[PDB]
Structure formats: structure tokens, C-alpha cells
Amino acid sequence: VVASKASSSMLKIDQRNKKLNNRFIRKAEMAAVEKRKLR
């Protein structure tokens, strides 16, 4: 393929952002559901 440097950088950014989203959004949702449950 011989990918460009900008495209490879964007791919690395996308992988990091996907991992960070999958952690943080799931943790926030768990905190919200436990708070709604304890009420």
C-alpha cells in the first residue's frame, strides 16, 4: 500500500481514542447505572 505518514498517524490516534472511549464511556455508564440503582 505504502501508506502516507499522516494516514498512519491518524490510524494510531484512532486506535488510542477507541481504547480510551471504550474504557471511559463504559466506566461512566457503570457509575451512572449504580447511582440510579441506589436511589
Binding site: 471504550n22 464511556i25 463504559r26 455508564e29 457503570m30 447505572v33
Partner: protein
């Protein structure tokens, strides 16, 4: 086990769209046609 969050549901939906796509019904119907229907009609 552990509970299932909304993010897990979106992971399952992502699996669905990774396997099927958005035009799977058209392609599957045409493939069924070409594979068997012409022979059966003949």
C-alpha cells in the same frame, strides 16, 4: 458474571454491521437467484 452496559450493546451492533453490512439483503437475494433459481426454472 458482570452486568451488560450500553457500550456492550453498541459492540454487538458493531459486530452485526461488520458481518452483514447495509445492503446484504440485495446481494443475498441476487446470489440465491443466480445460484439456484435459474436451474430450478429451467
Amino acid at each position: 458474571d458482570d452486568t451488560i452496559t450500553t457500550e456492550d450493546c453498541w459492540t454487538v451492533i458493531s459486530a452485526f454491521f461488520e458481518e452483514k453490512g447495509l445492503v446484504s439483503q440485495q446481494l443475498d437475494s441476487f446470489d440465491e437467484f443466480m445460484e439456484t433459481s435459474i436451474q430450478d426454472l429451467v
